[PDB]
Amino acid sequence: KSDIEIAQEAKIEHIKDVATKIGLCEDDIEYYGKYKAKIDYNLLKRFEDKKDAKLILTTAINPTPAGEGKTTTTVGLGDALRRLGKNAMIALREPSLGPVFGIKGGAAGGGYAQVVPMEDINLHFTGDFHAIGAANNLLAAMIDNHIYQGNELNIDPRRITWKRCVDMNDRQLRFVVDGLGGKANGTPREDGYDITVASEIMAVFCLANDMEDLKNRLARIIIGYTYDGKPVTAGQLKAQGAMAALLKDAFKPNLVQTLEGTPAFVHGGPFANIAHGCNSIIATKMALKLADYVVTEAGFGADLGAEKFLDIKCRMADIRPDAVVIVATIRALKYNGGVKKEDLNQENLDALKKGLPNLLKHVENITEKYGIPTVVAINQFPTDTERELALVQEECNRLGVNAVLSEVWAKGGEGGLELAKEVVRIIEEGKNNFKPIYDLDMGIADKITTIAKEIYGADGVEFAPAALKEINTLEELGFKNVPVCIAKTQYSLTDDPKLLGRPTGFKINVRNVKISAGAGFVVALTGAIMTMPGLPKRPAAEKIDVDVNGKIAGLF
Amino acid sequence: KSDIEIAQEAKIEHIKDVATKIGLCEDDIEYYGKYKAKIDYNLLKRFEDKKDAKLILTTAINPTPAGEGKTTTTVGLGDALRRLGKNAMIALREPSLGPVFGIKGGAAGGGYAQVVPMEDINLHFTGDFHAIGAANNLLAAMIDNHIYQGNELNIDPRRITWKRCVDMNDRQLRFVVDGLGGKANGTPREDGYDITVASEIMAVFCLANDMEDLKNRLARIIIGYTYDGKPVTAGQLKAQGAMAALLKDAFKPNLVQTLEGTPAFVHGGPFANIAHGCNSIIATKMALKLADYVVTEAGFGADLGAEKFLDIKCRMADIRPDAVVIVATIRALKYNGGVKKEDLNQENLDALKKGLPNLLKHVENITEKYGIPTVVAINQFPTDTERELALVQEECNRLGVNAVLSEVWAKGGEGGLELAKEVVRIIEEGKNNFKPIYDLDMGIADKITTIAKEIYGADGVEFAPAALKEINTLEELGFKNVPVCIAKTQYSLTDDPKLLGRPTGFKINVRNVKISAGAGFVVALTGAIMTMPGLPKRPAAEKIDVDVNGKIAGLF
Ligand SMILES: [K+]
Ligand SMILES: [K+]
Ligand SMILES: [K+]
Ligand SMILES: [K+]
């Protein structure tokens, strides 16, 4: 009935047998128990000529309180594809350790569309996030040590942008002063902690093509500035070698499985606002060699995660999407029309009509702006009536797109058969003219404007004076030709979370612009950003427990 | 040939095949690749009424700038016992991650007496220290959250004794102020970081009998005090279940091997000054059920590690040592006699006899105070003369103990055959009257006095006023009947590191006394303690590197 019940009651295959389904020898894998394995990244060099699998991006409409979660569809579509005899696998992100102790934690997907072992994935898993945190904190220690030991690079300690990290929900570490207790114990400065997944190490980890590229990106990281305002890099500190060493094992993608034994890579986990919201390039590229179909996803709605998957990841990974699945629900669209959280169980075509343009804007963006075959996945809910479901299908058909019902949550891979059938159809029959919505040689401001106008539907962008200054400085430093990562709210196409549906007559306000040199993109900031979540009054930690066997209870 | 070259060239068995030597099937072990495995701690409870293996404690004379073992002897002796057809295994500590990036990694042992894989052990290994850190930092976050959300327990944030941690040599975190940035972001307070291995979680982890005992020790931890001076525990914050959950897999002992395939547990790693300097109780007790002989060790010289192994660990684990090996070198003895670091290669029987009393005191302690069969191990060195060796043997025999030559560094197991014979002999023939040198009934000050008097050969102890008040306070809080852990210099029997040989007519100055309630012992402080070491001018990290293939270089 519950997710954990279904997970712990399911009969699961040994990971070797899962690895066999994607043509991996037992010399290619390293066991972490019977149900987890790391796959060596060096084998990707052997498949240099094999040609990529069909790539299916699961995205969604702007998230709402009604549902939803697109991962059940990602898992389900992978399960359904294998039930139709296709050699398919999936690539997901790994979840952060911190929130599990705040707000319980949950399944990668849910119902009969999950990945397992759930307990391991929601704790240490294979240790990647620890390795990522250790790299981040080595760099922090080496920055301060260099200053402490003489400061030949002339780093202004007040201008260190690099932050420490920990994978806990600890608001107490948001703003600190460290290096206190006299000259024997450091150099006093203002500092702060991000949760590990927010570190630039994570974005670099997830965007590296190979171990060589990983080290190059690490060296490229800008940790701060000199007294005269010159960037100082991790390479100047000779830190990249040691950081790569700490990430040697972690960089190997993790093989797990769905409930129905579909191979699954769970690897990496950056944010979808201040970063790109996708799982590792190494895992995606490796999955594209070892299978015939690959279903992956990007965080939040298609205005953020998909936009960044297509305009950042695809171009850095040199991969091309063959299909997009835009997940949605009737309830969510009624919410976009004006219906209150409590009143969503009642039929309302007029609200559905008013809030449906949110989906249509997304469907329009993928088909018309990006030029990719698209299908809409409607997750079934008891409340839904035929009239409601028909209007969605009707409006999607006006854009030349099918809206298929999905019951992957209740019925697993069977519930995704019709979706899977349609996905295969649009791959074979649908026209694909994919290209990123902007060219790399465009100016940073123009790129931010392009995404704002083309994807969000804005009249334009209002840059603050500080933003304009920062852009000029970044272009002066030689970063004009990198992609753009806009940090804004997920709940609306605009930068105002209240404006639901398909807002018009609006502009985006960019307050600041900051480079992530390792990641290789510029972050454009709109509102306030949370990089370190806190715990609630009654943390879920209080009800987590162990004893005989262990047997960890209270996680879910 | 360097240590890393020996380890890299050695032909090593599959851990399955190592495990079978101590009666373990694949269903008992949990792989971490081909060469590492975790063994379930619950396995111990079905060997309930099996008789314990022969327990051998490897210890040493006081450390010197020269060298002396100690681990090489522990590893080589295990190898030697197996060569004699005995079912022997070893238990060692895991090294901290931080120091590796400052002053390079080191072999678990040395020469031809190593434990492998060396690289993995000097990095993340099986992830235990990350888990231990996560538990520590979860508790920190829960303390601050509780205060932040209302502080029903009435914790005075200025009297929080619990510290955050990280496994990096970062002096910048020794003294901090956190909780800044206004009321949305915490409560301002003074704070600090320990290196992870100094966390009390490490001591609790290492002293827990089982999961039930682990959870009870965790809940028992005092994290600070209320505004009216009452202790506040992790139990009251309801964090023990969550911390236990983080430590579930970590608490399972790690199985690895020596170069000659001798089974080896590597588990836990606390300091030998502010803690007891032994590997985990769970690994030792579990080794005692799976083998016929178990060789283990404690940090620093017998005045520290052995004292704490015998007076703290043994009583808590309910184990009895059968033999003790005191490792020593001629050069180290001559250094105790006043010879300089540079002039040790020349023969000097005058200095040898002058510094021999250090060894004689340790031999006297183990044989007369503790009443355990003892053998002295002399690690061979080319410059040692026959007359020097003869003097040491004569003096040892004067106290009814043999000094056996050990060549385990150069010759491996073969070099320790003669030691193993003598170890087997003193077990069967030697009179064993083992008892700790103090009963738990005794008061805290008397317990401290007894150790100084008996083990260090002190005239007594000068307790500072603060120490006297702290001892009384603790006894009133109900901590009178707990063991005592004296933090002092390792280089001398006294608290003055300059005083070599066998000093007489001295007293130990105890400035403070602090409780580790989870660990279940009291810490007596003499001098200054470093719980967070710094990086040097040119960190080893600078020469650590990875190539295109992911091969790590420069770690050693
Ligand atoms: K995790
Ligand atoms: K800063
Ligand atoms: K380690
Ligand atoms: K404090």
Side-chain angles (χ1 to χ4, degrees):
Chain A
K1 222 298 180 179
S2 77
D3 287 355
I4 187 64
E5 282 171 309
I6 293 161
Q8 75 203 344
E9 192 172 3
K11 296 289 185 289
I12 307 300
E13 302 171 43
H14 196 274
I15 201 70
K16 188 175 73 70
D17 298 329
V18 179
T20 305
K21 297 173 187 180
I22 45 166
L24 287 171
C25 191
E26 201 166 11
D27 285 354
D28 313 345
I29 77 180
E30 308 177 43
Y31 294 110
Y32 285 73
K34 299 201 294 284
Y35 315 116
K36 303 168 297 202
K38 271 184 175 292
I39 315 304
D40 189 21
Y41 44 79
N42 289 327
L43 63 81
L44 210 155
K45 281 79 171 180
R46 312 212 325 282
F47 295 92
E48 191 266 318
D49 290 304
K50 180 157 180 180
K51 189 235 165 68
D52 292 358
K54 295 299 185 177
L55 179 58
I56 303 156
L57 176 69
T58 307
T59 179
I61 59 169
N62 293 82
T64 65
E68 313 92 314
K70 72 181 78 76
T71 303
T72 49
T73 301
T74 295
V75 170
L77 179 56
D79 283 349
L81 282 161
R82 292 206 75 92
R83 291 164 83 102
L84 301 179
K86 309 294 189 166
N87 186 20
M89 69 180 299
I90 61 173
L92 298 173
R93 290 178 293 170
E94 180 188 336
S96 176
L97 178 65
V100 162
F101 299 91
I103 48 163
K104 264 188 173 71
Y112 290 97
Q114 294 184 43
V115 173
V116 291
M118 197 168 60
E119 185 175 307
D120 295 5
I121 291 161
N122 283 256
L123 291 169
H124 311 298
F125 197 34
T126 61
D128 294 352
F129 285 18
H130 299 306
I132 290 162
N136 185 88
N137 290 334
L138 177 66
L139 186 46
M142 286 176 69
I143 288 163
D144 288 306
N145 180 66
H146 177 81
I147 288 160
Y148 189 76
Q149 301 282 6
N151 201 11
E152 290 82 0
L153 295 170
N154 210 48
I155 298 156
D156 188 346
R158 307 168 297 177
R159 300 180 80 173
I160 290 162
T161 53
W162 195 250
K163 291 176 73 182
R164 291 178 161 76
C165 80
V166 66
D167 202 345
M168 285 286 147
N169 287 24
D170 202 347
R171 69 172 64 78
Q172 188 71 1
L173 299 178
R174 283 175 190 158
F175 302 91
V176 313
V177 174
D178 49 38
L180 303 177
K183 70 159 180 291
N185 296 310
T187 307
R189 71 181 181 88
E190 292 177 299
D191 197 7
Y193 281 67
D194 297 316
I195 198 168
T196 303
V197 296
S199 167
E200 195 189 350
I201 303 298
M202 182 63 78
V204 168
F205 179 88
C206 294
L207 291 168
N209 274 316
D210 48 42
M211 182 51 51
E212 186 182 359
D213 187 50
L214 181 67
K215 194 167 68 172
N216 289 4
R217 289 162 166 279
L218 291 167
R220 220 160 61 184
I221 293 168
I222 296 172
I223 64 90
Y225 302 87
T226 59
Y227 284 99
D228 52 357
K230 299 191 163 200
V232 178
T233 65
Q236 289 171 280
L237 289 159
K238 301 182 175 168
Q240 70 271 38
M243 286 188 288
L246 285 159
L247 300 170
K248 183 205 78 178
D249 288 340
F251 194 58
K252 296 168 180 163
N254 307 300
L255 181 63
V256 280
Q257 66 192 289
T258 67
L259 295 167
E260 300 173 18
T262 305
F265 285 152
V266 174
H267 205 227
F271 292 168
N273 39 35
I274 55 156
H276 62 289
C278 308
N279 64 260
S280 67
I281 282 177
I282 186 61
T284 291
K285 285 176 75 66
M286 220 166 71
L288 287 176
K289 302 305 185 194
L290 297 166
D292 299 317
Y293 291 84
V294 178
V295 188
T296 188
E297 61 181 33
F300 298 144
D303 52 332
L304 287 166
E307 184 275 308
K308 293 165 189 181
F309 181 95
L310 301 167
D311 295 310
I312 304 175
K313 180 175 179 179
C314 289
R315 188 154 45 187
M316 285 187 180
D318 188 31
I319 59 175
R320 189 173 175 280
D322 304 281
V324 176
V325 180
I326 305 179
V327 175
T329 53
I330 294 292
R331 297 157 73 76
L333 298 167
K334 287 190 294 194
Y335 184 90
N336 278 248
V339 183
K340 310 309 186 185
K341 187 204 302 179
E342 297 85 347
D343 312 329
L344 296 167
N345 285 17
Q346 296 171 328
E347 178 172 7
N348 192 331
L349 275 55
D350 296 302
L352 184 64
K353 181 63 175 171
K354 285 163 60 58
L356 182 48
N358 190 252
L359 172 57
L360 297 174
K361 177 53 165 160
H362 290 303
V363 169
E364 184 164 308
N365 284 334
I366 308 306
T367 53
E368 196 168 301
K369 263 78 177 190
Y370 289 107
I372 310 164
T374 310
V375 61
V376 171
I378 308 295
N379 293 350
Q380 181 267 359
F381 202 87
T383 284
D384 295 15
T385 70
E386 299 289 356
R387 275 177 286 172
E388 291 177 308
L389 294 160
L391 176 56
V392 175
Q393 283 156 337
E394 185 178 1
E395 294 295 331
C396 291
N397 290 332
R398 295 174 193 277
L399 301 175
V401 177
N402 292 357
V404 182
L405 190 69
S406 177
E407 307 185 47
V408 296
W409 183 77
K411 302 180 174 177
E414 196 194 304
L417 291 169
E418 207 79 335
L419 179 63
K421 286 169 197 288
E422 174 60 11
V423 165
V424 174
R425 192 190 70 76
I426 64 168
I427 289 161
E428 291 173 350
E429 296 169 29
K431 193 75 192 72
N432 186 340
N433 197 48
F434 171 71
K435 76 174 193 178
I437 201 68
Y438 59 87
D439 293 319
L440 293 180
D441 290 352
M442 188 179 293
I444 292 167
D446 288 355
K447 289 163 168 154
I448 295 158
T449 308
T450 306
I451 298 165
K453 296 176 82 188
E454 297 297 333
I455 307 296
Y456 311 157
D459 303 345
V461 174
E462 182 61 26
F463 295 89
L468 291 165
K469 170 58 179 285
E470 286 160 326
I471 288 164
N472 290 320
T473 313
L474 290 175
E475 292 183 351
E476 279 169 21
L477 289 168
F479 291 111
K480 182 171 179 173
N481 305 331
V482 308
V484 162
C485 173
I486 299 178
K488 68 169 191 78
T489 184
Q490 66 272 43
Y491 304 107
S492 167
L493 295 156
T494 70
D495 57 20
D496 186 334
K498 302 288 187 180
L499 303 174
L500 303 170
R502 184 171 181 171
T504 55
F506 76 90
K507 290 188 182 175
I508 294 297
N509 275 290
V510 174
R511 59 173 177 77
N512 298 102
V513 172
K514 295 181 173 70
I515 191 67
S516 297
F521 57 73
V522 169
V523 185
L525 296 159
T526 52
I529 295 291
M530 176 170 285
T531 65
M532 177 53 90
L535 297 162
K537 179 145 200 164
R538 296 287 136 244
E542 295 183 353
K543 288 177 176 169
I544 296 171
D545 210 345
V546 194
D547 211 59
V548 72
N549 181 219
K551 208 190 84 272
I552 305 170
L555 289 185
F556 321 97
Chain B
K1 293 184 184 291
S2 75
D3 288 346
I4 186 60
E5 287 171 346
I6 290 168
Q8 190 179 342
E9 288 171 12
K11 191 166 186 170
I12 305 302
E13 303 182 56
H14 200 276
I15 202 70
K16 182 177 183 288
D17 302 326
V18 178
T20 53
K21 301 180 191 187
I22 52 173
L24 289 164
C25 162
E26 285 184 303
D27 291 13
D28 308 322
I29 76 184
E30 304 169 48
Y31 291 121
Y32 282 70
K34 293 156 57 181
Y35 306 108
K36 308 172 284 165
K38 277 188 172 297
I39 321 301
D40 192 341
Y41 50 83
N42 291 132
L43 207 77
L44 181 61
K45 78 219 298 289
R46 79 157 183 258
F47 291 94
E48 196 74 66
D49 304 309
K50 203 240 175 106
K51 193 146 185 286
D52 278 341
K54 304 300 181 190
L55 181 56
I56 307 162
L57 175 68
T58 316
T59 187
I61 60 175
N62 293 74
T64 57
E68 148 268 303
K70 181 195 298 98
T71 303
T72 34
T73 301
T74 311
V75 171
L77 178 53
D79 286 348
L81 287 160
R82 288 204 79 77
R83 283 169 174 252
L84 299 172
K86 321 304 285 207
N87 187 19
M89 73 177 291
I90 62 174
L92 305 171
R93 299 139 83 201
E94 194 194 324
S96 186
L97 179 69
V100 170
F101 297 94
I103 60 165
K104 289 177 172 173
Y112 283 99
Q114 296 182 42
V115 177
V116 290
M118 205 171 101
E119 198 188 83
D120 297 356
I121 290 166
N122 279 282
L123 294 172
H124 316 283
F125 195 33
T126 64
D128 295 350
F129 284 23
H130 295 299
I132 288 159
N136 182 97
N137 293 331
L138 175 66
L139 185 47
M142 288 180 68
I143 293 156
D144 291 303
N145 180 62
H146 170 88
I147 290 164
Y148 187 76
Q149 302 282 6
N151 201 15
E152 288 83 358
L153 297 161
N154 206 44
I155 299 163
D156 186 344
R158 309 167 301 183
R159 304 179 74 171
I160 288 168
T161 53
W162 195 253
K163 291 178 78 178
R164 293 179 155 78
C165 74
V166 61
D167 197 358
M168 286 286 154
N169 288 23
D170 201 353
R171 65 171 68 74
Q172 187 70 5
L173 299 171
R174 287 176 185 158
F175 295 94
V176 314
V177 174
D178 46 37
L180 304 174
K183 60 163 152 50
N185 294 305
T187 309
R189 71 180 182 84
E190 293 174 304
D191 197 3
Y193 282 64
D194 295 313
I195 196 160
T196 301
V197 299
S199 175
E200 204 199 334
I201 302 300
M202 181 61 72
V204 167
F205 178 93
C206 285
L207 289 169
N209 277 331
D210 46 45
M211 182 52 61
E212 188 186 353
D213 188 38
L214 184 68
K215 222 166 77 183
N216 293 347
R217 286 163 165 283
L218 284 168
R220 213 164 58 192
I221 290 164
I222 296 166
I223 59 83
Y225 302 85
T226 60
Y227 286 95
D228 55 344
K230 298 183 171 192
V232 182
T233 65
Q236 291 178 286
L237 288 165
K238 298 174 174 162
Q240 69 271 37
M243 285 186 293
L246 283 164
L247 300 173
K248 172 188 78 94
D249 290 334
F251 195 59
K252 297 171 183 182
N254 310 294
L255 178 54
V256 283
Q257 68 194 290
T258 72
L259 297 171
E260 302 177 10
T262 296
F265 282 155
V266 177
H267 204 232
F271 284 126
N273 41 23
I274 55 164
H276 62 286
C278 311
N279 67 66
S280 67
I281 276 182
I282 189 61
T284 293
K285 286 178 62 51
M286 195 149 152
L288 290 172
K289 301 308 193 189
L290 294 176
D292 296 321
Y293 295 84
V294 175
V295 199
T296 190
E297 61 175 28
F300 299 141
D303 56 334
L304 284 170
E307 189 277 317
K308 293 173 191 176
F309 180 93
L310 302 167
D311 295 318
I312 307 176
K313 185 180 173 175
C314 280
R315 203 192 281 98
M316 289 187 176
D318 188 21
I319 60 176
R320 202 168 87 102
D322 299 292
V324 174
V325 183
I326 299 166
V327 180
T329 59
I330 299 299
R331 275 115 303 110
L333 267 42
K334 287 196 296 199
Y335 173 83
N336 276 254
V339 182
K340 301 297 182 195
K341 173 60 167 63
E342 298 80 22
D343 309 303
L344 302 170
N345 293 356
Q346 299 181 45
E347 192 203 44
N348 190 351
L349 302 105
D350 200 49
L352 178 51
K353 197 196 77 176
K354 185 166 156 54
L356 234 161
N358 194 255
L359 175 57
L360 302 177
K361 177 53 171 168
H362 292 301
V363 169
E364 180 170 0
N365 288 340
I366 305 302
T367 56
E368 302 204 313
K369 313 288 185 173
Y370 290 102
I372 313 163
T374 306
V375 54
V376 176
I378 310 302
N379 286 344
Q380 74 95 0
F381 198 86
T383 63
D384 296 349
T385 70
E386 180 50 48
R387 203 185 293 94
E388 287 173 325
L389 293 164
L391 174 55
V392 172
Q393 286 165 327
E394 186 62 30
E395 296 277 18
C396 287
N397 290 337
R398 202 184 316 285
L399 306 180
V401 177
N402 290 307
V404 188
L405 195 76
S406 171
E407 322 204 309
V408 296
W409 182 83
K411 293 190 173 189
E414 193 182 63
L417 286 165
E418 292 296 289
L419 180 61
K421 291 174 200 293
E422 177 60 15
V423 169
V424 169
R425 194 195 65 76
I426 62 175
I427 286 162
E428 292 173 13
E429 301 186 36
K431 219 310 187 198
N432 195 338
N433 294 116
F434 174 68
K435 193 74 197 300
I437 61 105
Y438 61 83
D439 300 316
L440 297 178
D441 299 34
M442 192 178 294
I444 294 170
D446 287 348
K447 282 160 157 165
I448 293 159
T449 312
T450 313
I451 297 162
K453 293 277 280 283
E454 302 293 302
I455 309 300
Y456 311 157
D459 284 2
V461 178
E462 281 186 11
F463 298 87
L468 296 174
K469 198 191 171 184
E470 287 163 349
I471 286 164
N472 287 132
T473 308
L474 289 172
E475 287 183 4
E476 292 197 83
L477 294 171
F479 291 105
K480 185 171 191 290
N481 294 324
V482 307
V484 165
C485 177
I486 301 171
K488 72 167 186 76
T489 186
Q490 67 269 31
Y491 303 112
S492 163
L493 285 158
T494 75
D495 54 3
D496 181 358
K498 303 287 184 174
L499 305 177
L500 305 172
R502 182 173 183 171
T504 57
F506 74 91
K507 278 201 175 78
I508 299 299
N509 292 290
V510 177
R511 58 168 177 75
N512 297 99
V513 168
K514 305 290 174 60
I515 188 70
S516 290
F521 59 70
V522 165
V523 180
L525 301 167
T526 55
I529 299 297
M530 178 168 287
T531 63
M532 173 60 90
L535 289 163
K537 174 65 170 172
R538 292 290 141 218
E542 293 182 344
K543 289 174 177 182
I544 292 170
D545 202 357
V546 187
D547 62 22
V548 295
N549 292 338
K551 192 187 197 298
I552 297 168
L555 195 64
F556 310 96

